[PDB]
Structures are given as structure tokens and as C-alpha cells.
Amino acid sequence: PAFRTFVASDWGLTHLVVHEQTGEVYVGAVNRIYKLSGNLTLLRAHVTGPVEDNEKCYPPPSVQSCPHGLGSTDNVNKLLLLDYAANRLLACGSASQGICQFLRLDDLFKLGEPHHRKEHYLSSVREAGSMAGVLIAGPPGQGQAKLFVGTPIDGKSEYFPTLSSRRLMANEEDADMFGFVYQDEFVSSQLKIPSDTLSKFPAFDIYYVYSFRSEQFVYYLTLQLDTQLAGEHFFTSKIVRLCVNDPKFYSYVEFPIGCEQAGVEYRLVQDAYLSRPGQALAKQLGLAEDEEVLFTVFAQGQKNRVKPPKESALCLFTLRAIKEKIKERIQSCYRGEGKLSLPWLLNKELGCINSPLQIDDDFCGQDFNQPLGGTVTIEGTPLFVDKEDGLTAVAAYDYQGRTVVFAGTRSGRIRKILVDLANPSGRPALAYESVVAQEGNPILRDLVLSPNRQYLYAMTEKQVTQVPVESCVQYTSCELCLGSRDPHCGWCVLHSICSRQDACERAEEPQRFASDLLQCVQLTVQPRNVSVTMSQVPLVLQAWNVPDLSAGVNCSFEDFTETESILEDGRIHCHSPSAREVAPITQGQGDQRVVKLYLKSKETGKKFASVDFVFYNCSVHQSCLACVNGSFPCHWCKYRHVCTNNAADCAFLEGRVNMSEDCPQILPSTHIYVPVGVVKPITLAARNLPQPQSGQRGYECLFHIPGSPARVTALRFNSSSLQCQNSSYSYEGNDVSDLPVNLSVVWNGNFVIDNPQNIQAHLYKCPALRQSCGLCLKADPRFECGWCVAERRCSLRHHCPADSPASWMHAHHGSSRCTDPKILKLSPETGPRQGGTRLTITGENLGLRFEDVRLGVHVGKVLCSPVESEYISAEQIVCEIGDASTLRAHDALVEVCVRDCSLHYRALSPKRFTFVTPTFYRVSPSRGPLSGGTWIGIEGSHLNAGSDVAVSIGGRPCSFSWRNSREIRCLTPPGHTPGSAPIVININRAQLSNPEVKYNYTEDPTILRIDPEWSINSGGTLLTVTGTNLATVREPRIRAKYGGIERENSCMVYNDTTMVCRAPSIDNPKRSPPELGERPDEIGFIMDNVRTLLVLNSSSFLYYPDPVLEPLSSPLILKGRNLLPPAPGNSRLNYTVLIGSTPCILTVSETQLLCEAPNKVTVRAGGFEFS
């Protein structure tokens, strides 16, 4: 669907209203007033606009000449009011001291526009919507039509009244128009701004936002100025009221109004809307039918009425409660208590006069205690609060009891709120949000429901938009329909659509319309699963929450088929489709097809209720396991080797598989070891192996070796054992010793028996991976592969000659010492004398158990204890060295004795392990910031010793980087308190100290001033920076974030207070700085871990754009644009014009360069060059 819309072709719009009979929509705008159809087609356009005029002029140029210069100005529609009684439209403008227009209702024919007298002028004010009011009428001949109207004044106190009661004559040409209801030389039916109050508070003014007639009164929601809150302007939002039948204007009342949400103040009205609550909200808010209610919108605080805050709150007032606050306040002043308290009106405070009276809601004011104010600000019940997108407008309405609220947003969005405080729920909940002018055109206060209350016309600055109160048809499913909750929506069961009660035919009948999710259609089928091979199966259907279907029903499995059904009890009986029909579906989807079986109602002819219905196909299973041990009833035929639903389709009786444990499958034995190039048989076990039948061949073993696949015929001995015949196997590579290979056991050529455990054959070669005795006896005892002394290589007994009865050696259980251990290399080459070092020895022909190498390892004399977990048998020993303090030697060779220190079974390291004692004497900054992050350079001797290193400053750990013989470099942690700190370095079990070498933590540096407060796009200019403790950071640098890019540049520290910095380049091909200048997203300095200096909140640093230069005894003159920027202070570019290498003395001007020449020319300024 699309939202019906009227676009504002040229100008902004201001007001909208709907005619209660026709549904015609009238639209006030700047310079225009439109009549529109219900669907927002243009019907008629009135020009009201651009008028030659001037605001300063009293009576406008028409009546008297004005000395002030006139110009073509825009006429803003300030107000718009439907006068149904006199078949017309009051269309009050501005820009003529506020003269009012009368347009005829059905064609916009100007009936009248009075502007001779002073009353025909309303206000100079050129602001839209700061005005409001109501039209009230009696029958012709009686007390005639009146207009109550508030407007701002702009300080023109003596020209215009802010609030007035004015006359509406039947003749638009009649001069009496907009004259006051009762005028006297003492009191007139108007209320003026006192001159004394404008002298005191310069630009006090009353802005009227909303207005409505209620019972017998007239209310206004207003904004005023600081008068007990010269200074600055802060506003107070108030309610005003009058009796309709009070020509004297004595009934005037004025209470401050707002509401609070968790200690946050909302005191600025943006809009309101008087309404009903309907049965729902009325009851639990405690009201009678015709009792009224006022929805409102407030912004946070009391700041900036011209441009309010995003923070906004929708509150609520019951009029009975405001009526009680006013009655309570009047029955209080008629007790003589306190003053009237109305700052702007009465400057000197007159007192409350006591008197005996029957104070009623019918009270219309009296002569003494006069116009009066309000002390107790009236608090409202909060409903919904937007924090990211400010509310702008509101409306509400009664729907079948439930109270729907409409809320415009600054974004151009409308919210559809059920108010549920009086309703069961925890608090009033948003139901739905909708889009009007998505780009961010705000919605305006004038937001009216249609007469039929089917739509809601939503006005923006630039477009009117017909938003339906209901569009439930976007909801596809009963479950989503009633899930949205926006109360207009119900599921019209038999039409399978989502819409309102009045739109669902026959909804009034039983179960035909669903309103709570529990009413949703629930369906079940008895035979949920039906086989492809079956046909016309009887199915029973149970359905609940469904109307009387005695109209008739069909079953449609999808848009493929449709079978007739008959009704009995609370059940529906229909048949499955034919095999001829079923397969057209299942073809392609294989294993199974889940299909949504619907019910098609005869009355509607639309599918409404559904179920998961399964069409299973046994035949497509191509193995016993899939067939039986699947999820379905399927039978496997051992002999035909096919899966099917029918027992009889099997070969014969004794070949039917119904149980998964009875399947043809290969069972595992202890691993199948196969040496390459050796004639071997491979016996297998299995279960229920078939006797090959008529015209059927015997068994084979197929080996899936990528290099060569071997086909070897086999013999089936019984239902439980196989054997491939004497053969040898190979693969071409010599790359991997142990290759596991997929084998498939076949019979009758292509029938592959099932392999559940996926049993493999391991093809092993005698080592192409092991040229060391220790490596062979290390590998599987299964391979049978062993080490053969004489050859100096390793192969089976098979492949090695027995010249001695013990010439071929195999690790019996691992009780096999391996001759000639050798050490290749060992890590840490150095270590501390104290020990604790983890020595990492890597050899080739070591022992095969740990408990033999344990006790074997020694470093010269020093006993070394080996580690279990970190020991990799006969390749690697990890060993922990003991205390070597007592050793005389400085360095010693490493020794391993395999089990016994026998003369052939000992290894000695090729180069020797060195003992030292590392020392340190200097640190290369000795100072650094408390936050830390300083690159420290500890100098000493033997610093690269051992395994682990840990540096601790104040007990807190340093982040390590790299190690050297002479240097340790690490990054400092944050210090607890500033000053001297101990440096503790521990290498393994050695903990070395020096109290003469300390580290001094320094108070965090500060940045005060950058001097020039600017630079160009490519940067590179000098910046004279000032602050504190700047010598405590060795390498500080400037940081700047422009757009999505972050960039850095260098600094040179001079004093503890002074620093020269080279400005960061922000060169971005996406954004260029404007001629005016631009602040970066972030600007700061990188100083170790002091992170508060990375981002500068107070900084006003600006970036200007990068010079334009024109090419080809008298002096040189070089012309061009952008030579000098509009920069603060003196600060300008240090230009240098050079010739081959010689610089000149030049005076720089804004368009020209005055170099001096004696007769290849290069101009330089920072990092800029041009020829």
C-alpha cells in the first residue's frame, strides 16, 4: 500500500482542519490557504500572500501612510477556524498588523477581510501557531457568534490585547467585526499587557499553543516569561480559563502546569488535545461518560521556547481534576488567604478578600479579588517518554472502549499508543510506529482525525499525509495479526485476513472473528505421516476455535491438489491424494517433503487452517542404516539391497530387516595394519552378510588409495566373516609413514556393504620418516616395524637378515635402550647461578620412558630434574636445573644418561651451558608519568640469560618487549603514588636488585595553551604549546581526528612548561576544511598513559584549507589565490622563495609574492612546494 499525500509545492504549511460534515480538509499556509478532498487531492487554492508591507507600521499602509520602507513580505497563516454556522472559514493572517480573512466554505470565496478599525488588527507577530482560540455561537437573533482568541504581542502592549472576547457579525462586510463583546471606558472584554511590566521585563510575551471549549468555558495552554522565574529568558507553561458568559473578564484563572518523570522536569507545552476516554480509561480513572480528558506534550526544563529540547513527555490531565484545583483555589481566596499572585498582570500585589459564598464549578468571577493567579503548579500523569526523538503533536480517540493516542515526532513519525494505566498492563505501551516525512520533517500540532475516524491527517512543514488509524492487512497470520496488539486488528478466520470488526463479514457470529491470540485456529491430522506409495488414505482432522463449517470444506495439501471431505462429530474426514498425484510433488525433494495441508472453506474459498503434513519416500534410502535406523517405518531387503515400505517387496521372508541391530554391516577388529609391498591377507568380521543369490557374484575388497585403487576378490566364510586374498599394496610419495585408507567391501560388482564405524586400512611404510632407532621403537607396536642394527636403518624382521640371533631390535614393551643418544641443541644457552631454569634439550636417540631419563640429566655436576608433561619421548627433554651456587665452574657441558651411565649410552652437548649472574646499572628514562606507558631501557650485563623474565616497578609488572645481552626494554605500568620506586628483575629462580638505581614517578602533565590556535589541511606548521611537567614525557606527540581518520605528529620539549609541536596533517580526499574554518572531531596529545590529555574538551583549535600559484634588476612578482588565511592573532606562513638554492628577502601580500632577483624558481611554505 501507499500513503495518500498532498505535497507543498512552494511554501511551508502552518495549520490544518477538517470539516465535520464533508471531510474536506482545509490547510493554512504561508501565502496560501488550500481546500482538499478526503484523499488529499487539491480542490481549491487561495492566494493570501506576498504582500507589500512592514511590521513597524501601525495601521498598515492601506489606511495611513507610513514613513518606514515597504517590501514584498510573506503573509503567514497564524490561525484557522471553521465557522460552520455561517458557512465559512476564519483564516487569520499576519503581516498587516494581523488582519483577519473570511473565506467561503465550499469555494474559498473571500466574503470579507476587515481592516479599517483598530480591532480589525490582531497582532504584528509574524510567528505561526503562537496564536489559538475557539469559535462559539448561538442561534440567529439571540446573542450572536463570538471569538475568543489569544495572541502574542511583541511588546505592542497598547495596540493589541493578548486575550480578547470578540464579536462575529453575520455580514463579513459589516464593520462591527472583531469588536469586543462588551466595551466600557473602565472595563472591556479583553486583557492587555501592562506597560509597567514591559518596562521591568523587556520582552515578556504570551504565546498561545492550544485552545478548546469545554462544557461552558474556554481553556488555553500558554507559555510566558521569567516573572519570579534583567537577566535571561525562562518560560512557564500554564493553563488559562474563562466563562463563556463573562463579558467583564472576571473569571480569568491561570495555573502553572507540567509533570515529572524520575526527578526530571517537563514544563514546556508543545501541543495538547482534549478528548474522551471511552469505557476503558474512564472506569479506572474514575470518571462519568461525558467527563473530558486532556492529553499533552511537554519538553524538558524551562529553556529555549524558540528551539526546545529533544527530551519530551506525554502527560495526562482529567478535567475534573483541573476543575477541582480551580474550585479549590477559589474557595481559598474567598477565605481571604494570601494574595492574588499574578506577576505580569498586577505588579503590586492586591490581597484576597474574604466573603461568604457558595463556591461552585458554575462560579464565573466577581468584582473584587478579580483576575487571579495560581500557587500550586498542577502535576500531570505521565504516559510515554521519548529521549532520542522529540514528540511534537498529539491526538486521541475512543475505539470500542480502548483509548488510542497519536503522537507526532521531530522525525516525521506517528506513534499509536494504547494508554493502559487504567487498563490491566504495567504502564501505557506503544503499539506501532509509522512514517510520513521520513527525511526528518517534524509533524505539526494540527493533527486531526477524519469525521468517519478512519484516517488521521498528519501535517508537516512541507506535506499533508493521510495516515490510516487502521492497516491490519499488512498482517499475514492470525499469530502476527493479534500479536501486533494495535487494537483495530482482528483475524477474520474464514477470509484468512487481518482487519477491523466492521470489515469482517459475519464477524458477529460464533468463532468467525478472533481477537485474542488464543482464538487463533489450531489444527491436527491423525495420520501425520503418509508414504508416497500409499494412495487415497483416510485421514481424520481435529480443529478447534472454528465457526460452523456446515457450509462445506475441502482439504488442499497445497496448491497442488484438493479432496472433498465430510463432517462427523467434531472431526473432518478427507482422503490423501493418488499415487499419480503424490509423486509430482515429492520428485526432487528426496528423503521427505513436509507440506502445509490447508483447509479451504466453501463459504469463503480461502485457505485458513494449516498443519505440518509429511510425505515420506522409503525407496530413496540407499543403505540398511538409513532405512531402518532412520526416523520412519521402513523395511530393508538384505538380498535385493533396496529399502521399501512393503514386507512382501523383499526378496523373500528371511531377508527382511526391521531392526537396526540385524542390519549387513562390517564390525571392527583391532586395527588393520598393512605394510607396503608385503603379501598379506586381511581377515574381517561383520554381521548378517548375505548369501549371494541367483545371477549374483561374490565379494571383493576395494581400497580407496588416491595413488592406486586396488580390487581384490574375497571369500565370505559365513554370515559373520570375510577375507581379502594374499596381495601387496603401495602408495606413491614416501611422504607420510601412516596412511589410513577408506575401504569398501563390495559384492555382485556394485553392492557396497554398510560400514558404520567407517573401518579403514592403515598402510604403513618402514621408515621414510625415521632414520633413528629411537623413532622406530617409538611408533606403533602394531606396525611390527623395528630397528635393524647392521643396515643402520629400520624395517620388519621380514626385510632384515638375521646374521646374529639379536640383529633386529624391537621395543619389547619399551624396555629397549637405544643406542648412541645424541644432543642436537638446547635452549636457554645461559642461566642464573641460583638455578630454577627450565632447560629445553632436543636430541635424536633418547630413552623411550620418562622414568629412565629422570635422574639421567645433569649440567656438568649440577643435578637437573626433568619434567613429565613437557617431555616428548626420545626427541625432547624439558629439565629444571637445581642450585649451582656451590659450583666452581662458570660453564659446563650437558649430559644425559639414558637409564644407566653406560659407555655407549651417554650423550654430551656439542656446545656448553653457561652460568652467569645478570646485573643492571642504569635506566634510560629515569622519570615517567604516573599513568605509565613509558618505554624503559634497562642497561646491564648478562641480561639475556635463562628462560623467563619479569620486571617489577613498585611491585607492579612491566610489559615486556625485547631482551638483549646489554639491554631490557619494557613498557611501564601505572604507579600508585608519585616519587621513587624500586626496580626488581627476576630471571627464573634468580631475583636481582639495585637500590641505587630507582625510577621516579612524575604529577600528571597538563596542557594549557596552543599558540597559534590553527593550521592548514596538510599541517606541518609550528605550534607553541604551554603546560606543566612536560619534561617527564620523553616522546610526546599531537593527535587529531578529522572525519573517520586519526593522525599524529611530533613534538620537541624545551622546558618543563614549554614545547614546540609540528601540526598533524589531516589530508582527506573525502572532506576538505572550509574557508571559514572547522574544528576536528578530536584534538589532544599522546603522553604515555595520561589518557585525559588524548581528547581536549575546551579546545577551540581550527583547521583551514591548504596556496594557488600561477606559472609563466626588476623584482619578482608571483600572483595567485589562497596565499593568506583569515587566522587569529598575528601568526602567518613563513614563505621562502628560492632560486636553485639561494633564498630571497621578500614581503608577502594576500595575492602577490614580492621576491627580489639579480637577473628553476621554487616557492616553499611549511610542507608545500610549487614551481
Ligand SMILES: *[C@@H]1O[C@H](CO)[C@@H](O[C@@H]2O[C@H](CO)[C@@H](O[C@@H]3O[C@H](CO[C@H]4O[C@H](CO[C@H]5O[C@H](CO)[C@@H](O)[C@H](O)[C@@H]5O)[C@@H](O)[C@H](O[C@H]5O[C@H](CO)[C@@H](O)[C@H](O)[C@@H]5O)[C@@H]4O)[C@@H](O)[C@H](O[C@H]4O[C@H](CO)[C@@H](O)[C@H](O)[C@@H]4O)[C@@H]3O)[C@H](O)[C@H]2NC(C)=O)[C@H](O)[C@H]1NC(C)=O
Ligand atoms: C521416491 O524417490 C525415488 C528415488 O529417489 C524416485 O524414483 C526415481 O525416479 C526418477 C524418475 O524421475 C529416476 O530418475 C531417472 O532415472 C533414469 C534412469 O534410471 C536408471 O538408473 C537408476 C539409477 O541407478 C543408481 O542407483 C543404484 C541403486 O542405488 C546404484 O546401484 C547405481 O550405481 C546408480 O547410481 C536405476 O535405479 C534405474 O532402475 C530402476 O528402474 C527399473 C525399471 O522400473 C527397476 O526395475 C529398478 O528396480 C530401478 O527402480 C534405471 O536403470 C534416467 O533416465 C534419468 O536421468 C536423466 O535425467 C537427469 C535429470 O534431468 C539427468 O541428470 C541425466 O543425465 C539423465 O538425462 C533420471 O535420473 C530415478 O532413477 C528413480 N530412482 C530409483 C532408485 O529408481 C521417485 O521420485 C520417488 N518414488 C515415487 C514412486 O514417486
Ligand SMILES: *[C@H]1O[C@H](CO)[C@@H](O[C@@H]2O[C@H](CO)[C@@H](O[C@@H]3O[C@H](CO[C@H]4O[C@H](CO[C@H]5O[C@H](CO)[C@@H](O)[C@H](O)[C@@H]5O)[C@@H](O)[C@H](O[C@H]5O[C@H](CO)[C@@H](O)[C@H](O)[C@@H]5O)[C@@H]4O)[C@@H](O)[C@H](O[C@H]4O[C@H](CO)[C@@H](O)[C@H](O)[C@@H]4O)[C@@H]3O)[C@H](O)[C@H]2NC(C)=O)[C@H](O)[C@H]1NC(C)=O
Ligand atoms: C624555557 O625556554 C622557553 C623557550 O625556549 C622560554 O620561552 C621564551 O623565553 C624567551 C626568553 O628566554 C622569550 O623571548 C623573549 O621575548 C621578548 C618579547 O616577547 C615578544 O616576542 C615573542 C617572540 O616573538 C617570536 O615568536 C612569535 C610567535 O611564535 C613569532 O611570531 C615572531 O616571529 C618571533 O619569532 C612573542 O612570543 C611574545 O608574545 C608573548 O606574549 C604575549 C602577550 O603577553 C602572549 O599572549 C603570548 O602567548 C606570548 O607568550 C612577545 O610578543 C623579547 O623582548 C626577548 O628579547 C630579550 O632577550 C634576548 C635573549 O635573552 C636578548 O637578546 C634581548 O636583548 C632581549 O633582552 C626574548 O626574545 C619568550 O617570550 C618565551 N616564550 C613564551 C611563549 O613565553 C621560557 O621562558 C623558558 N621557561 C622557563 C620556565 O625558564
Ligand SMILES: *[C@@H]1O[C@H](CO)[C@@H](O[C@@H]2O[C@H](CO)[C@@H](O[C@@H]3O[C@H](CO[C@H]4O[C@H](CO)[C@@H](O)[C@H](O[C@H]5O[C@H](CO)[C@@H](O)[C@H](O)[C@@H]5O)[C@@H]4O)[C@@H](O)[C@H](O)[C@@H]3O)[C@H](O)[C@H]2NC(C)=O)[C@H](O)[C@H]1NC(C)=O
Ligand atoms: C507418523 O504418523 C503417525 C500417525 O499415525 C504418528 O504415529 C503416532 O506417534 C505417536 C508418538 O510419536 C503416538 O503417541 C503415543 O501413544 C502411545 C500409546 O500407543 C498405543 O496407543 C496407540 C493409539 O491408541 C496405538 O496406535 C499403539 O499401537 C501401535 O503399536 C503396535 C505395536 O507396535 C502396532 O502393532 C500398532 O500398529 C500401532 O502402531 C499403542 O497401542 C503412548 O504410550 C505415547 O506416550 C504416545 O502418546 C501415536 O499413538 C501414534 N499414532 C498411531 C496411530 O500409531 C507418528 O508420530 C509419525 N511419525 C513420525 C516419525 O513423526
Ligand SMILES: *[C@@H]1O[C@H](CO)[C@@H](O[C@@H]2O[C@H](CO)[C@@H](O[C@@H]3O[C@H](CO[C@H]4O[C@H](CO)[C@@H](O)[C@H](O[C@H]5O[C@H](CO)[C@@H](O)[C@H](O)[C@@H]5O)[C@@H]4O)[C@@H](O)[C@H](O)[C@@H]3O)[C@H](O)[C@H]2NC(C)=O)[C@H](O)[C@H]1NC(C)=O
Ligand atoms: C621525582 O619527580 C618529582 C617531579 O618531577 C620531583 O619533584 C620535583 O623536583 C624538581 C627538581 O628538579 C623541582 O624543581 C625545582 O624546584 C625547586 C623548588 O621547589 C618549589 O617550587 C616548585 C615550583 O614552583 C613547587 O612545585 C614545589 O612545591 C611542591 O612541593 C610541595 C610540598 O611537597 C607541594 O605541596 C606542592 O604541590 C608542589 O608539588 C616547591 O615549593 C627549585 O629550588 C629548583 O630551582 C627547581 O625549579 C620540582 O619543583 C619538583 N616537582 C614536583 C611536581 O614536585 C622529585 O624531586 C623527584 N624525586 C627524586 C627523588 O628525585
Ligand SMILES: *[C@@H]1O[C@H](CO)[C@@H](O[C@@H]2O[C@H](CO)[C@@H](O[C@@H]3O[C@H](CO)[C@@H](O)[C@H](O[C@H]4O[C@H](CO)[C@@H](O)[C@H](O)[C@@H]4O)[C@@H]3O)[C@H](O)[C@H]2NC(C)=O)[C@H](O)[C@H]1NC(C)=O
Ligand atoms: C475519496 O475518499 C473516498 C473514501 O473516503 C474513496 O472512495 C471510496 O473508495 C472505496 C475503495 O477505496 C470504495 O469502497 C468500495 O465499496 C464497494 C461497494 O459499493 C465495494 O464493491 C468495493 O470493494 C472492492 O474493493 C475491495 C478492496 O479493494 C475488494 O476487496 C473488492 O474485490 C472490490 O473490488 C469497495 O469496498 C467506495 O466506493 C468509495 N467510498 C464511498 C463512500 O463511496 C476514494 O478513494 C477517494 N476519491 C477521490 C476522488 O479522491
Ligand SMILES: *[C@@H]1O[C@H](CO)[C@@H](O[C@@H]2O[C@H](CO)[C@@H](O[C@@H]3O[C@H](CO)[C@@H](O)[C@H](O[C@H]4O[C@H](CO)[C@@H](O)[C@H](O)[C@@H]4O)[C@@H]3O)[C@H](O)[C@H]2NC(C)=O)[C@H](O)[C@H]1NC(C)=O
Ligand atoms: C472440492 O473438491 C471437489 C472434489 O475433490 C472438487 O471437484 C472438482 O471440480 C472440478 C471442476 O471445478 C473438476 O474438474 C473437471 O473435470 C473435467 C473432467 O471430468 C475436466 O475436463 C475439467 O478440467 C478443465 O478445467 C480445468 C480448470 O479450468 C483445466 O485445468 C483443465 O485443463 C480442463 O480444461 C474440469 O475442471 C474435478 O473433476 C473435481 N475433482 C474431482 C476429484 O473429481 C472441487 O474443486 C472442490 N469443490 C468446490 C465447490 O470448490
Ligand SMILES: *[C@@H]1O[C@H](CO)[C@@H](O[C@@H]2O[C@H](CO)[C@@H](O[C@@H]3O[C@H](CO)[C@@H](O)[C@H](O)[C@@H]3O)[C@H](O)[C@H]2NC(C)=O)[C@H](O)[C@H]1NC(C)=O
Ligand atoms: C565363520 O568362519 C570363520 C572364518 O572361516 C571362522 O573363524 C575362524 O575361527 C577359528 C576357530 O575355529 C579360528 O581358528 C584358529 O586359528 C588358529 C591359527 O592361528 C589356531 O591356533 C586355533 O586353534 C584356531 O583353530 C580362525 O582363526 C578363524 N578364521 C579366520 C580366517 O581367521 C568362524 O569360526 C566361523 N563362525 C561361525 C559362527 O561359524
Ligand SMILES: *[C@@H]1O[C@H](CO)[C@@H](O[C@@H]2O[C@H](CO)[C@@H](O[C@@H]3O[C@H](CO)[C@@H](O)[C@H](O)[C@@H]3O)[C@H](O)[C@H]2NC(C)=O)[C@H](O)[C@H]1NC(C)=O
Ligand atoms: C574417506 O571417508 C571419509 C568419511 O566417510 C570421507 O570424509 C567425509 O565423508 C562424509 C560422508 O560420511 C562427508 O560428510 C557429509 O557432510 C555433509 C554436511 O553438509 C552432509 O550433508 C552429508 O550427508 C555427509 O555426511 C564429508 O563431506 C567428507 N569429508 C570431507 C572433508 O569432504 C572422505 O571423503 C573419504 N576420503 C577420500 C580420500 O575420499
Ligand SMILES: *[C@@H]1O[C@H](CO)[C@@H](O)[C@H](O)[C@H]1NC(C)=O
Ligand atoms: C542408530 O540408532 C542408534 C540407537 O537409536 C543411535 O545410537 C545412532 O545414533 C544411530 N546411528 C546411525 C548411523 O544412524
Ligand SMILES: *[C@@H]1O[C@H](CO)[C@@H](O)[C@H](O)[C@H]1NC(C)=O
Ligand atoms: C598366503 O595365504 C595363505 C592362506 O592364508 C597362507 O597359507 C600363506 O602362508 C600366505 N602366503 C604368503 C607368502 O604370505
